[PDB]
């Protein structure tokens, strides 16, 4: 209580580089949130209803390394900064929050669960401001309801002088609209 998180690193540099090139990933996948890496950058993805969602500005058009080889994106929406792959087997898929709570939590790549007040469809305010440096690399990270259902995924931070007062996210609604579209 309220909601807790911890992280487990599965790969190092060399293995990431190699896995990058082969497109083949034979490690077991576990957990609701995946830590993702390209050569240039690192960020997060959240599995919601069988799809692993992340941000375009992290993933680009790239495939995701998988047990059978590279997985092609199932959903690519550039204007909303959203992409998705079918979740690898073993990821714990979360469920959308329909209950309409405005009391949210953002899960950072550091496995902190931080309080957010929903201010609108795609926006929420950090109840306690954090340094920009603290949120970097957490895009694709989930925003949660108290029940632990997913409200959407972390997209961008609203910041001044390296301090972030709020966050922009991609609602599970946008995810559904992208799926019904494609």
């Amino acid at each position: 209580a309220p909601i807790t998180a911890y992280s487990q690193q599965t790969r190092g540099l060399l293995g990431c580089i190699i896995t990058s090139l082969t497109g083949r990933d034979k490690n077991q996948v576990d957990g609701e949130v995946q830590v993702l890496s390209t050569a240039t950058q690192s960020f997060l993805a959240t599995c919601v209803n069988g799809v692993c969602w992340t941000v375009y500005h992290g993933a680009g058009s790239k495939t995701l390394a998988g047990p059978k080889g590279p997985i092609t994106q199932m959903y690519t929406n550039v204007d909303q900064d959203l992409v998705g792959w079918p979740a690898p087997p073993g990821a714990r898929s979360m469920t959308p929050c329909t209950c309409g709570s405005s009391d949210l939590y953002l899960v950072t790549r550091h496995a902190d669960v931080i309080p957010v007040r929903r201010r609108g469809d795609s926006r929420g305010s950090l109840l306690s401001p954090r340094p920009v440096s603290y949120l970097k690399g957490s895009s694709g990270g989930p925003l949660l309801c108290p029940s632990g259902h997913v409200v959407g995924i972390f997209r961008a931070a609203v910041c001044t002088r390296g301090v972030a007062k709020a966050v922009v996210f991609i609602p599970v609604e946008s995810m559904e609209t992208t799926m019904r579209a494609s």
């Binding site: 909601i3 807790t4 998180a5 911890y6 992280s7 487990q8 690193q9 599965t10 790969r11 990431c16 896995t19 990058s20 090139l21 082969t22 497109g23 990933d25 490690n27 996948v29 576990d30 957990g31 609701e32 949130v33 995946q34 830590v35 993702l36 890496s37 390209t38 050569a39 690192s42 997060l44 992340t54 992290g58 993933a59 790239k62 495939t63 995701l64 390394a65 590279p70 690898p88 714990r92 979360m94 899960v107 790549r109 496995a111 949660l144 632990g148």
Partner: peptide
């Protein structure tokens, strides 16, 4: 310009 790679995960409770 390769694949995105899962390098870790996060477990919720």
């Amino acid at each position: 310009k390769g694949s995105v790679v899962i390098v870790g995960r996060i477990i919720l409770s």
